[PDB]
Amino acid sequence: TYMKIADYGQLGEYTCDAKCDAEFGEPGNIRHLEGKTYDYRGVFCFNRKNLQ
């Protein structure tokens, strides 16, 4: 399990005099992730003499 910062987001910018519109802005996500693993699992067989 790992994390993936999707985005950072904006924070209210460059207001000279109070108009009170962009107070909090919007932040991004952290997006926890996962992932598994796999396997091969093969076999074979000879009898006793065709190998000897």
Partner: protein
Amino acid sequence: MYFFSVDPRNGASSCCCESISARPGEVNGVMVSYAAWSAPLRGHGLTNKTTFEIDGVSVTPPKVSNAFGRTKVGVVFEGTLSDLFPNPEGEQVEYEISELNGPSNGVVELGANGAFTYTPGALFTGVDRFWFSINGNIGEYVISVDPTTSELPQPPFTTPVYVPAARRSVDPRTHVLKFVLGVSPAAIPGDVYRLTVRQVAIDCDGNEFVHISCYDISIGSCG
């Protein structure tokens, strides 16, 4: 410079539309203060979405007609000025070219009988005008010198009273609108035109507060 305080639309505040006096040829600047009406409407103040309109309540149609001229770059142009004054009575034709409203990138030599030579300025291409006066009645003669490739378009014969395309501004910090009021030298003294201005404000979120007011531009001679 004109200045006007707009009514605040509060239920408490001759004709109704205010008056404006102008002289033929002048180009002035007008101011209006929307502070009384837009400041209580706490928001983002005004916007640059002003809309004007011109209509005349008395025109007294002109005597002499206008005309159009066409010629290539650098080549001397010739034209007549006698067909532009169909007169009802019989009287001589005192052609005159005002040194105040003459051409801007050329020169004109007024002939003896309604003839004139427009030699455009060398290394120049565009449109140029000059305001004649056939026995008192003022009209404009427009000439466009083409840059020798194909042709140039046809200008719209600027009106008696006009507001320029983009020469206005607005200061949302103090709620003041500024624009320009131009009157061509062809306006007849005595007429009155009506100018309507539709100003729109904006709230804290992006809605509209529209405002309409009118003015009576009175074209009078001698200021």
